[PDB]
Design a binder for this molecule. Structure first.
Ligand SMILES: [K+]
Ligand SMILES: [K+]
Ligand SMILES: [K+]
Ligand SMILES: [K+]
Ligand SMILES: [K+]
Ligand SMILES: [K+]
Ligand SMILES: [K+]
Length: 176
């Protein structure tokens, strides 16, 4: 299900795979898509990360769909986060955001990379359940998300709406 944000079509629900950094990154990503059985990919390569985000046409994904996760994770990697009265990098963060159409997005990032299923879209209800479940593992710098999550009483929380974080060519899904 595309997520329409302004006149752009975004997607959640990619499967995130960290890459070895040892071989040609693109060729490694392709070979892993073949083993994991995915026909679409995005490639996230910056100083903080070498990772591929995968999807299948059969699940309703298509070339040209933009990765919402890629966009959000980039934006936090650049800005960092505000908590404890300080501006600091947030390599380990989790969050949930209202999308314009009423669905919610859930994100779980460690060392500036997505956890394998840390990019999810569905109901508010289930986004919160996913957030708490991952939260229990610990090692999280901050929860970043919809201002109403303050009432969850996480130790470190930064209110943030998706609008505040909003593209780059690399976000678009392409054939493997
Ligand atoms: K991985
Ligand atoms: K993975
Ligand atoms: K995504
Ligand atoms: K995995
Ligand atoms: K997995
Ligand atoms: K996960
Ligand atoms: K952990």
């Amino acid at each position: 299900q595309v997520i329409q944000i302004g006149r752009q079509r975004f997607v959640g629900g990619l499967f995130w795979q960290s890459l070895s950094r040892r071989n040609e990154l693109r060729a490694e990503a392709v070979e892993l898509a073949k083993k994991l059985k995915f026909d679409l990919m995005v490639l996230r390569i910056d100083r903080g990360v070498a990772a591929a985000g995968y999807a299948n046409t059969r699940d309703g994904f298509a070339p040209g769909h933009l990765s919402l996760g890629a966009m959000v994770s980039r934006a936090i990697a650049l800005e960092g986060a505000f908590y404890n009265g300080r501006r600091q990098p947030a390599p380990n963060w989790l969050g949930a955001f209202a999308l314009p159409d009423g669905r919610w997005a859930y994100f779980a990032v460690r060392d500036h990379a997505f956890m394998p299923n840390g990019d999810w879209v569905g109901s508010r209800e289930e986004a919160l359940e996913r957030l708490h479940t991952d939260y229990a593992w610990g090692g999280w710098n901050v929860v970043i998300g919809e201002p109403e999550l303050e009432r969850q009483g996480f130790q470190n929380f930064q209110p943030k709406r998706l609008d505040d974080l909003l593209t780059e060519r690399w976000w678009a899904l392409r054939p493997v």
